[model samples]
Each structure stands twice: as structure tokens, then as C-alpha cells.
Target chain A: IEFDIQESKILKGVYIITPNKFRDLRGEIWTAFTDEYLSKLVPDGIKFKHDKFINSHFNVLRGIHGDVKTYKLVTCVYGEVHQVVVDCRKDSPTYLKWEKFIISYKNQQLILLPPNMGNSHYVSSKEAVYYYKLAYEGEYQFTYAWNDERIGIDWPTNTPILSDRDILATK
Target chain B: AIEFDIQESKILKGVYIITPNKFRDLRGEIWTAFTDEYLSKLVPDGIKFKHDKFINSHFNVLRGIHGDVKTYKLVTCVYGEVHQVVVDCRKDSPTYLKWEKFIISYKNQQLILLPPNMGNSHYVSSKEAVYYYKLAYEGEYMDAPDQFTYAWNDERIGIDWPTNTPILSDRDILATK
Candidate 1:
């Protein structure tokens, strides 16, 4: 089955979420993401849990990968990073289309990933923290050697700090 | 003491207020305590105004109130940074409860206050913020009865906010629960 990928005008690609707040004598109060409220915005709704990932300075790139059954939402809560996603669904009208979002501490935004897409990101800040919500409860299948030129991701490379794994990966 | 600003028009009663004396700039400090000149423009019909000051970075989230059809507000992000979110809470209004978001940062240096019952939430995006508002009526602050909440991660109200996880208190998290 083919699905149409629409871009969001208020935000970039799909939806962008922000919490609501309440103030009182004690101080101010805000409510983060709610599954029930989120269902109204996401298509083919699914309730998922989140996990936090932390990285130090100059962390190189990871992934250009996709999952067959699961989709995810990735957000950079602290520091800055470059996130890239490539549509790989053969049935998708925009197949092979890639998009990038510069997630930074100045603006707390998350990138929504649909199922079956190659994804990769690089951390640029001294310390970066990432939060991601996964659709299914399973180990991720890594597509080793994400640097393959066949995919040809136009990544920024002024000074791409690489790791041992990245160095050995096929370019 | 908190300062409040009122804007009473013939057709609508708008109110906007915030913590006062809370703005600090590189050159000097700035704060507002119920100024008639500023409040008059927002609510020409004459109204009461109040203000207050609060400390903390994206640490505070104030609101979830609905804008009454008869009342409206004009809010200002006088100092520091904040994320102001407006959700159409009018049961009969076309956008009824539909949510919209705008960033009122130090760069924008503006305020936003709505009519009574228009749902609002202030997400602190900076280390500290000083907010000012004008309203139409007094003694009319009622907690949103329906209490609708949108996920910060929802793709629909896509706002380009600072990505850093705000330093939230336990109470902040509990509110969402």
C-alpha cells in the first residue's frame, strides 16, 4: 500500500508539538506530551515509550537506516545536532526524498520518522542529549556502513570527527 | 505584589497580566506594575492591570486557561524568553479548541493576551522571563473547565522552540498526568 507524505506548514514535515503551562501562587506548571492528545495529530496512531541517549563532543554520524515494522520520533533536548532522514519506501510517492532538521537547545523540536526510512544524525555541540520514542519493542537492526556513496547523503563536512567504526565503514 | 492589566471594550472584556519587575537587560533592569498608558491601548474601555515577577529558566509553565468569548487579552514577553501557546477553546468558534503556538523570545519583545476562556500555556524558554498582559474583566480567572492538553511532541502544532529539555519540576510533570 502507498502512503502520501505531506509536509507541515506550521512546522517542517508532519507535526511539531509544544506543551501547555499553568501558573499559580507556588509558581508555573507545564504539561509535556500526552498520548491521548498526540493521537489527534499522528496518523495510524501508536502509543510508544521513550528512551534518552547522551553523547559527548564531536560524536560522528550514526545510521542511514530503516525499520520494516516500526517508526519513531527523535528529538534533541540539549545541545545541537544535524538530523537527516531519507524516504526509502518503494511505494511512497516521495521515495528517496531526504530532509534535514537542525535541532538545537535554542529550539526544542523533534523529528518524526515514518516507518521504512534511512536515518542518520551527527552531534555538533560539546555535549548532546537525544530523546527518542520507538514504535515497537524490539532491538534495532543496524545497516552497517551507513556511509555508502550509493545513498549519497549530502552531509556537512567542515570537520567531521569520526570513530573507529565509522573509519572502517564502507564509503 | 503581582501586577494585572485590564482592557475593557464595549463589546469584549480582555485581560492580560504577569509577574512584574522581572526583566533584566544587559544595560539595565526593567519591570512593569500596572501602567495605565500601556493597558489603555490594549483595552481602551478602561480596566485594571497587575504584574508580577518570576525566576527560573524554561523552568515554568503557566496556564491552560480558556478565553471567554466576551473577553480577550494582549500579552507581551517583556523580558527574557518564553513560548506562548494558544488553543481555540471556544466551543462554538470555528477553530474550537484547535491549538496554535508562537515564540515570544527576547528577540520578539512582545506580549500576547487573549479574551476570557481562550486556552493558553506559557512555556518558559529562557533562564527567566518577565511577562505583561492586559485584560477586560477582573475577578474572572477560572481554571479551564475542560482542561484540554496537547503533546509537546505532537506534529500538528509544530513550533520551532529551543530543543533543550526544560528544567521542569516534579509538579510540572505531575500536571500532565
Candidate 2:
């Protein structure tokens, strides 16, 4: 019932959710997701169709991904990550423009990316596990270039551990 | 470009993981880095990665948890080994105190995208390590009230480092968690 919600600084659609935390000696506790909480953020009647958890090791830059016509709500509970989102809508003023967020368990923040945007993230810790809620249920996806010079992402490391798709990615 | 020689795939939100579809010939080895039109389906209007860096890291070294209020980053290790970490320091975010980590190495080509207000730190696992990233904004590095940081080994964050005793500067070691 205590989350400071706000829209991320992007153009079309990106929401930032911060849940209130009760931190004591016994580790920590916070409301990551709930029907009531999500309802407050999302429109009524429709519910999140797909829920997934991503467990990645360091250098597991798993992003620049989003399904066709899919909206996603992303959050990290176990570790840390530098989450990035790119507005790919041709009509959007911020098209091709990207943004970043540092999320983790202690921070307890959530990111909701709207449809038509591409996102990517760098695992900044030894291992990061994130939970994502997708508005759509279908699973048709596309790929992207890890090092596209034109987009000019300004990644941290040039010689990054990349998947074949990222390596083969082109602008 | 080549065949469907991909190993495995997983999608988180909009993040994608594609391994190298390597093909070796008598001459040498040919790998798939990317295809010009590959991102057409996923990324809109041709959103490609930018600003690449080829870094070299030694074992047991700690390279930061740095943050910039305006600039965002994407990092991926090309070769060697490293453990990357990120912290959510957005004063106004619901997940303000959360953090995450990812293991990036040459063998596993996992590209990372870092958003603004997020700081990063990496510790080398192998003899040498490297990665890449891009930015969104070019404003002043988040400092003081807006930008903040903590010790690489700050007890508050309690980041589980590979080497409990990392190789870092006194300032970083003394940085608050």
C-alpha cells in the first residue's frame, strides 16, 4: 500500500514503481508485486498474462529484447542490474532514444516498458535475477546488434562477452 | 547470415541473449556478430548499439560501482571473465535500494543495457577481461545529492564478490555502503 509510483523519463511509455520496504535485522521484506498494487498502476479489467524470472551471471547483458506488441513490467529482486530501455516507435519524438535504471532487491523498484520499445541490460553483479510481467501472452520475438555504432549506446566495455546475435548485430 | 546454429535463447522484458553461431573453415573461423537487418523485427527504426570500449582487466581487481545522473551505460565482456554489479540509487524510485548482478565472459555473449541513475562495478575473474556500453544522455556525471556511490565492499550492500578481498583503491575500500 506504500509505493512511490512515477513515470520514467521516457517519451511513449515507461513506468517506475518504488515499493515501501520494511528493513530489519532479519534481512529485508517488501511488496514486489500484488494484484492490488498492479491494479493501481495498470488499467483495470486486464491482468498480466506472463510472469518470468531471469537469472543471469555477471556480463549477462540480456536485453534489447521485447516481443511483438508486448508490454512488460520488469523488476530485480535478488541482485543488481543496469536496466536500459529504447524507444523504437518511429512516431515517438524520443525514438531510438534510450534510458537506464539501477534496480535491485534493496532498492525494490519496478520498470514497466510499453509496447514497441526495445530494451537491454547489463548484469553489474556476480548474478542478477529479475522478474518480468508481460501484458501479452504470445511469444514472437526479434533480435538486435550488441555493438551498433550508429545507435551509439556508449556501453561500458567494448570487448564485451556477447552472444552471436549481439556480435553479428548491425545498425 | 549463416545457418540456425544458435545454442540457446532467453528473453527478459526486452533483453535478448543469442550465442555465437560459429562456423570454422580451413582458412580460419567465421562467427556471426550481427546482421544489418536483423534487428528490424525487435528494435524499431533501427536502434543499434553505440560507443564501444575494449578494456583489459586483471584477476581480483575491482572496477567500480560508478553512477551518472544523466548518462546511461550498456556493458558486455568480450573475452576473459568478470562479475558485474548494478545498484538502483534513484532517490525517487520505488526500487531505490535494490541491486542486481550478471556474469559476463567471452564464452557467454550476454550484452547488457544500463539506464540512467544506475551505477556499476566489475571484478575480473580471469587473467584479463573486457566489455562494451552506450549512453543516452551526456549531462554532468550525477554528483553529490543527485549522484551517489558506496564502497565496493561496503557492508550495507553486501555484494558477494568472487574474491572476498578485491584489489581496489583505499578510497573505494573506504567508500560507504
Candidate 3:
């Protein structure tokens, strides 16, 4: 699983997570994040931190936001989600190109989001739970509307559960 | 870093071997793993791969002739003392009957392996070591009958190991091809 980064982009940082399967008589049981394993991925820095966001019943729209200076790693730990990322680095050769990943319980893969990349996700299941690891911690976090017409995400054809703020937010 | 596609061979039945490229970082933030763009271009025929992190403390020597029948592996040392020897036992190949020894330390990251009958040995010289590797097969161990071994220091197959006197485990000392 070794990849070469030929594209000369800023080396902001890296985000990593180890997933654990929770199995019961029906299947398995447990949380996806393993503190010990993650410690090895990024050493000599701030304490490991995580934020969980839970959405109910096909909360289809999320974000396509990019940070000005921060980079993050996003993971779908519970339920399934359609995660889409757009490479928006204006100077990047692959600028404006988008990639989609159906990260779910079956794969438990974590997505590493580079800086200045527009990212948005839609929950594919009844209720979706996801977590993210950030390089720099602070509030006023940069965010963008999920259905920004300029960067239309082509979200799945199900009606979404939207908030009042989401309806009024600008890209 | 080069993305290596899995290739199948008969060194052991039902197993495939993969050799990954080594990437160097000047600024130390290189993400050496498959990315979406790279995956789309090369991984058309999908394959299954898993990663494992190995910890080796000072004076720890882990090895002596081990390989998988159903799993082709790719290994890289990330930190601390790491040394390896690769022996090629693919009897009918050009590099067959050849062996290469590599010492992958902090300065350089290299790939090493024990293809089939080729033996391998590693020693940790630093206080602690961390290495990562990927495996193609699952649910098999060293005693599966199919997962076989050869002697570590078999003079017939002299390894010219990094250390003249690597702290040997009893099993390694007693191992024979």
C-alpha cells in the first residue's frame, strides 16, 4: 500500500485511523478508532483528538468545504456514506477533478483530505455516523454549502433532511 | 514510489507476491500509500491487501528463513534499526540461486523479501524499530505445512548477513532448508 506523490503540493500533514470491527451473534461490536494504533501514524505532535457527527435518516447534504491552511482525514466509522472530494488547488495539475469513495462498514477505510480540496459527503444509510481528525484545532472552521451550484455534487436522488441554516448558507 | 501490481507464482500454491516501490521524502511528509488517482490508473483488476505494523526493540533479531505459500508480501522499515537479506530460490529464473542483503536504516527505506526457498534475517540496532508490510493472503501462519522455511545460516546458502554475529533464536540456529 505504498503510493508516490509526484504532484508538488504543500506538505500540510497526514491523518490516520485504525478501525475495529464490533461482532456479536449477529455480527461484531466495537468502536472504529484505536488510540494505540493511531499514535504510531503521527508521532511527536499534539494529543490525538476526534470529533463525531451524527445525522439521522438520510441527512443527505453535508459539505464541499476546503480549509485555507488546514488538512484533515475523514472516516465513516458507522453506517455508510458517499464521500466525494474535489481537488481545488488552483495551481495543482489535477485541480477541479473529483473522486468518489463509498466508504462503509465493509471497508472501514479512512480518506486523507489534502488542503484546499473541496469535500462533501452524503449519508447513504438511515443514520450515518462519521468522525474526522484534524491537524490544527480551532473554531470558525471553514465550511461551504453542500449543494453549491457552482460545484454541484450531484447528490443521490433521495430527499435530504436540511437545516434552516443550510437552506440560507452561501458557498 | 511505484505502485506494484500483484503477480501470481507457484513458489507456494494459491499465493501471490507483490513488490511495492520505495518513496523518499525530503520534507518528511510523504504519504506513501495508494491514493484515489493512482488507484484508478493501475488497480483495474482489483486485489485485496492488508497492512501490519511490526515493533522491534534493540538487540532484537527477527527472522531466519520464512515466507508464505498463499501470501506475497511487501515490507518497509520506517524507523530505527532494520536490516534484511533476500535470497532468490525461483529455481528456473534468471536471478535464481542469487541472494541480496540490504541494511535499511533511517537514511534510506528499502524493500526486502524471502522469495519461497530464499532465506531472510533482520536485526534491530536502535532502541526501537517500526516497520510496515502488506500481505495478499489471509488466515495462514508459519505452521500451515504449506508455509515453509529454510535454514538461516546454511553455509550452502551463505547470506553474508549485515552482522557477522546476529543474536540468533534457537529455532533459527536449528533451522535447515
Which has the greatest DockQ?
Answer: 3
Candidate 2 Cα outliers beyond 4 Å, as residue runs: A43-45, A137-140, B1-177
For every candidate, what is the interface RMSD in angstroms?
Answer: 19.0, 16.7, 15.8
Q: By how many angstroms RMSD does model 2 differ from the true structure? A: 17.2
lDDT to native, each model: 0.50, 0.58, 0.50
- Candidate 1 lDDT by residue in tens digits, B89-130: 556765654555667754444455566556555677665554
- In candidate 3, stretches whose alpha carbon ends up further than 4 angstroms from where it belongs are A1-171, B1-29, B33-46, B60-62, B112-120, B138-146
TM-score of each: 0.42, 0.47, 0.42
Name the lDDT of candidate 2: 0.58
Each predicted complex: what DockQ?
0.01, 0.02, 0.03
Error of 3 at B29 (Å): 4.4
* Residue A75 C-alpha lDDT in model 3: 62
Clashes of 1: 67
True contacts kept of 2: 0.00
Lowest-sum lDDT 10-residue window in model 1 chain A: A1-10
Instruction: Kindly report the root-mean-square deviation of model 1 from the true structure over all alpha carbons.
Output: 19.0
Better of 1 and 2 by lDDT: 2
